[PDB]
Amino acid sequence: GLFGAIAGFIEGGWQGMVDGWYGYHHSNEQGSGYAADKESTQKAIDGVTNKVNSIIDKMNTQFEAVGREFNNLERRIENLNKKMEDGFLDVWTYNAELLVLMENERTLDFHDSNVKNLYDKVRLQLRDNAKELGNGCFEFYHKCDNECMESIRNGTYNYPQYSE
Amino acid sequence: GLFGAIAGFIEGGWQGMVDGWYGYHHSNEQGSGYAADKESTQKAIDGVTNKVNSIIDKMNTQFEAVGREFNNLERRIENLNKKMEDGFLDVWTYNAELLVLMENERTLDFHDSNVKNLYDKVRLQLRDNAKELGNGCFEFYHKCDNECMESIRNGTYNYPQYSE
Amino acid sequence: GLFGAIAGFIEGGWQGMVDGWYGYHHSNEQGSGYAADKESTQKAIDGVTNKVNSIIDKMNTQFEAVGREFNNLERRIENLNKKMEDGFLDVWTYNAELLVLMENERTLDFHDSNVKNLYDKVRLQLRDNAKELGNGCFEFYHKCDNECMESIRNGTYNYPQYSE
Amino acid sequence: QDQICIGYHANNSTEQVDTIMEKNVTVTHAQDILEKTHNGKLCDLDGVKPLILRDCSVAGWLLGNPMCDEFINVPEWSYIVEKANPTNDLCYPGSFNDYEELKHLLSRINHFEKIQIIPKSSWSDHEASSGVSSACPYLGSPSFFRNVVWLIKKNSTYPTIKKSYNNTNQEDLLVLWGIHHPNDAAEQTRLYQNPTTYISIGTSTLNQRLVPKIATRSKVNGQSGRMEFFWTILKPNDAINFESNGNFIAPEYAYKIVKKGDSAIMKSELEYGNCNTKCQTPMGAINSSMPFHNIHPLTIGECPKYVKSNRLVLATGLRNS
Amino acid sequence: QDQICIGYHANNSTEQVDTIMEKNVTVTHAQDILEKTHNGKLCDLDGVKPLILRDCSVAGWLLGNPMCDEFINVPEWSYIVEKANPTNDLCYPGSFNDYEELKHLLSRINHFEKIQIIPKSSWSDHEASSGVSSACPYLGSPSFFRNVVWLIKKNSTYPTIKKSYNNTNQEDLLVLWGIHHPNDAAEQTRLYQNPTTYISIGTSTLNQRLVPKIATRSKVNGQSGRMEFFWTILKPNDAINFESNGNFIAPEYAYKIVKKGDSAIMKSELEYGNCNTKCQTPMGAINSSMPFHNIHPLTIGECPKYVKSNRLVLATGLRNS
Amino acid sequence: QDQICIGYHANNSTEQVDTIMEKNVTVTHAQDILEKTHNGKLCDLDGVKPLILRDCSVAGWLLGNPMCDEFINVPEWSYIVEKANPTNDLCYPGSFNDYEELKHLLSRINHFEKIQIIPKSSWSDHEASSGVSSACPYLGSPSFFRNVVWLIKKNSTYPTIKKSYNNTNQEDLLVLWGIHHPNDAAEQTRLYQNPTTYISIGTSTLNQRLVPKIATRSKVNGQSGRMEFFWTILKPNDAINFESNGNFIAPEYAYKIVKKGDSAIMKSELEYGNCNTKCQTPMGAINSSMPFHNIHPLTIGECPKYVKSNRLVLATGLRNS
Ligand SMILES: CC(=O)N[C@@H]1[C@@H](O)[C@H](O[C@@H]2O[C@H](CO)[C@H](O)[C@H](O[C@]3(C(=O)O)C[C@H](O)[C@@H](NC(C)=O)[C@H]([C@H](O)[C@H](O)CO)O3)[C@H]2O)[C@@H](CO)O[C@H]1O
Ligand SMILES: CC(=O)N[C@@H]1[C@@H](O)[C@H](O[C@@H]2O[C@H](CO)[C@H](O)[C@H](O[C@]3(C(=O)O)C[C@H](O)[C@@H](NC(C)=O)[C@H]([C@H](O)[C@H](O)CO)O3)[C@H]2O)[C@@H](CO)O[C@H]1O
Ligand SMILES: CC(=O)N[C@@H]1[C@@H](O)[C@H](O[C@@H]2O[C@H](CO)[C@H](O)[C@H](O[C@]3(C(=O)O)C[C@H](O)[C@@H](NC(C)=O)[C@H]([C@H](O)[C@H](O)CO)O3)[C@H]2O)[C@@H](CO)O[C@H]1O
Ligand SMILES: *[C@@H]1O[C@H](CO)[C@@H](O)[C@H](O)[C@H]1NC(C)=O
């Protein structure tokens, strides 16, 4: 993990979060549950789908492979044709594989980055009014109903509160 | 935004900052204004200019395109010549486009990273003596003249101060 | 430095740390010394060695270079053969160079990222019980023997302690 | 006390991907973009069936090899399938000038229609009904190529021939003819009285003068004699002119190129399955939305891009455990 | 209370770029690196003007087609512009051996200087002033190729010719000659008494023996006869040797390759504008510092690299709003 | 008070690398992956020594140029080294048909064994001991190509020859022969009484009829005459048939292709050093574990991949100061 988030300081993933990729787990006086962060998840899906389609669109003008015949005394240009189509085959195969690997990495670090950024979106909302447990959770110093939870989810967290 | 800085927790850019790419906005008892962070901006410009020139320098040995003639009974090697120059054309066009996209991304995340790093350069200078407003500003607990502002700009911030 | 760690807020490297790439410097009542962080360093070495071998393995199917002869009235296909092998030479040379540059960058930002992540691994262990000096060190509010140092190294840091 | 936590999705998937620094990385979601499966059949290409020569080559087909009477009248095709080693080619030994160059022409043609341009009955002053050999047996009796006619002397005399054909059609004409190289002078005289023979052929652009090459050669299919075939593409309103005093294997049937277009010639041992595809390889057809495949380079139709890889998986989901 | 803030630059720009994950991203600064504009004119190349054959081909030019008298004396050129379909080529029907291979030679030559190596007046025992045809009319009267001479019999007799030329020059010599293929024996006799003719040609490396091909062919420009032209490059101090008893279209003017070097042959319908460039395409010249362009593959001069893209913009500035 | 610090490794290294944004970046550790050094010698290739023709070409070698008697009997080789400009090639002027195409064949052959297929003593009715020239002097006396024999008339008469050879061997046979083009008719008669000569050659697939080309040509090595050599590959059990009434340069020794396989033909001015390698370039051999090199494109053996770069260093360590 490049950013330390996925499989780092956040040691694991949520099997119980099924409504998207990212989200929150709340546990207050009105029950406990997993919610999925809409807009970040969406922007991620946009990123990766647009990425796949980008990769495809970048390889619609590849190399064809027409077959050519040569006689018993045209061994040279036959060899040339072979060597050259085989050549292009090698280069485009290389391009596809390498691009795929690179963008796989870029993708994983992309998800990692999104998790990091969410964690900071919430952390900067709850300055003193919450404590870092360390494992990716924020513990409340006050009692926080489902509406405060939602205000943190949609970003409309009303900070004006005590803490001791 | 990969690092959350540009168009993230810092919601917007400064139209009023015209002396460079990065900088600070101060608002104290001796007036209010935008200053531009010299060395970071410079190192960025170096990065991206050297990047452009790098990309160019990586494509001075491309593929030419000499024309060749073939008769009515040389359709095969004519087809080969065509298919092969068209082939190289496809591969170098691919290379240029793909490289451009990739380095565009690398560039944006590069600026994002520079903003992040500046924000931390100042944050680590003003430990307790300032509060995180959250939107990318640090509020002073003490009164800070233009010289403290400059000391923070050039990195020579004298920390020895109270805060309550 | 992309993450601000190497040659950024941590201004320099340790000549005295010779047991690996990353680690810690402790200075307590039982002596002062450099220790090397085992698993992170190892995972890094894995990353970069696997990277080198990956790059090599991605270039075992390159382009050969068989020589071909052509007479005084076969100037055209001679020119074609030349232009095409020279072409492939250009494209594979390009590929190797460009890949190398890119992965050099990816490597440096990879080390930077590892340093950042370690710094956060320790920072999240020592919440209040230590102060950020700013230069990449954590100062203890309590007296910390070699065993607390080790507990921080291997991640088994027993937090339950005072600080004033 | 209340609390709130940040985390990420995990699930029950085993799909692995590979990166530059780490291989076989397990993820929640992944997308294969590599098609690795074919049907093993040669199918119709967009509804129109390909011409599959069985054990026939293009030479044997077009010259009218008797053993190729399966293809006397071939309808419009999509692509052409020839085996690697057709058993039925030049039943009578010899050669085909610019054969490969003609095969290349076939790649831009979807339909010939054979038409008699010179009736066999028209040779009043020669024999056109004795041009047979045991090297080309049809049904156990000595025969020959159908599209051409092997003239020999009549009443101990082979008069000079001045035969011509004006392409009055609006289509291009593939015209084929040949020359017989005997193996001794006695044979040359025996078949075509004149000892020193030739065949002159002219069009707007064509100007050639063949002479037979008497020479001692080994037996191929029981004959030491050879046939050498030549061809040309007659333009509409253009005419072809033959003058010969011997060894002349005359045209009889020619082919009207009535439908040009992007076609191809496949090499494949496979035979026709009764299917239909938008993409065809020599070893099977493809039905996939996948952008890549690793079946065969030589591909025809509306197809994915061929790649040498054994495995290409793109990472859609995140890191799982 | 005092405060300090961190932020980034924004401005009033609409320049978009594209990334792998996000398209049409707006930024503060951006740099186009793709040249997409030409002048539509064929210009001088580094001050030296190209040889532009109008409706002339290389064949028609070099053989001295009368309709190509515009180019009897061509100065040093940069590149060569030929149209796709030159109307004036082989005014008298026939062929040019290894034509494409000669055109390829022109790519390494910047200047020929024509010199008379065989004066028309030197043919005492033949007619060199009656070698004309209506297939090559100049100003409404039957003419012929200027650089060569069509010898015919004199006083009902065509004696064998033994003409030779020693390249005493220090330059390479492009030497051209030809053979006349008549359409009947009566014509062969009519022009060159000898029924069975030939033309032998020898140098240090050259050893060939042409014989005419009498054959019935169709009319091109009103003639059923054909001319076939051959060429060679005579080394300095090397000599060329002709022996012939008929059908010989002799050389008269040859070309001294006095200036070699990197040149080219362009195909273009465009004509000469009065301009100057360091980079020339067949559809226009380029004046740009841009590293790329998308105008034409076939490029000559000090030029940017051609690329198929319609749009390439590199991101210099950061994300704007 | 106690404290703990986080940092990274530094050391005493000066190895620089290059990135996309920053060049000449100093690091603690780095890995060169580019081999830039050779031995300057042509070595054995996996223990088996290459055939190095000194100033001999393939033509001169195989035809049995006397000045090439160093290679009368060549053992199994790995690759073949020819100089750019071999001084000893066709000692007697003329040509070698499909020479390049034969050189290409050599790339798949590791060993010929020369065998006499036609003894010089067998020409009872002709002279086979007077086929010499001063254009091919061996030890200061007029000689000729050893592998072939230049027959001339005996007792003022050159009878027609009907010589044949059945390849009874289980190996393919490279068979070479030739034709002599004289420079006048008097010479033609002088050497081979018959004024109008030819050489017919036939196999299963071969059917050719050479005729000499009398022509006036310049002197190469003091002779205006020319030799043109032809070749073919005789299959096992196949036979070759010669019929000729003159100008026939007959085969005598032929080469059994007894060891096929991946070989090559190198162009190099270098001579044999006494070494051994797994990778050979025309300018030196390579012994490296490096994956790349920048020595020469044309590489043979178990070799690294050639690349144009002058410097390729991969960054293993981190940023140092
Ligand atoms: C015991 C005995 O004497 N047997 C002969 C027997 O040799 C002979 O057979 C003929 O052999 C000749 C060559 O010697 C040819 O090979 C003939 O075969 C063919 C063929 O079948 O194609 C025969 C054919 O009839 C010929 N057609 C014409 C128009 O001539 C062709 C043609 O000549 C070849 O292509 C020539 O190159 O030859 C074969 O009949 C028979 C008949 O002569 O008589 C026996 O007594
Ligand atoms: C009503 C009538 O009888 N009309 C004839 C008329 O046919 C004839 O014209 C000649 O026709 C012949 C073929 O039959 C040629 O085509 C002649 O044309 C040319 C040409 O112009 O190039 C003529 C030219 O003078 C010839 N030059 C020489 C040296 O012979 C060439 C040359 O022969 C061709 O290239 C041959 O292939 O032919 C054309 O004059 C005229 C004159 O004979 O008489 C009418 O009565
Ligand atoms: C003063 C004087 O008269 N001198 C003659 C002198 O010219 C002549 O030398 C012969 O010159 C002829 C051509 O005129 C040939 O060039 C002969 O050279 C060769 C050769 O050495 O290869 C000679 C050789 O003996 C010939 N071999 C055969 C089988 O004929 C070949 C061969 O003819 C050529 O390859 C032909 O193209 O020619 C050269 O001897 C001598 C002898 O005639 O007499 C002097 O008096
Ligand atoms: C063929 O016939 C047409 C008219 O039917 C005629 O114009 C043309 O000249 C003829 N073709 C030739 C080559 O003579």
Ligand SMILES: *[C@@H]1O[C@H](CO)[C@@H](O)[C@H](O)[C@H]1NC(C)=O
């Ligand atoms: C041409 O002349 C030179 C001397 O002027 C002579 O040496 C040379 O042999 C001649 N060329 C030929 C091929 O005879």
Ligand SMILES: *[C@@H]1O[C@H](CO)[C@@H](O)[C@H](O)[C@H]1NC(C)=O
């Ligand atoms: C050569 O000899 C074999 C038997 O030894 C025979 O079968 C074959 O026909 C002969 N080759 C030819 C071409 O005649």
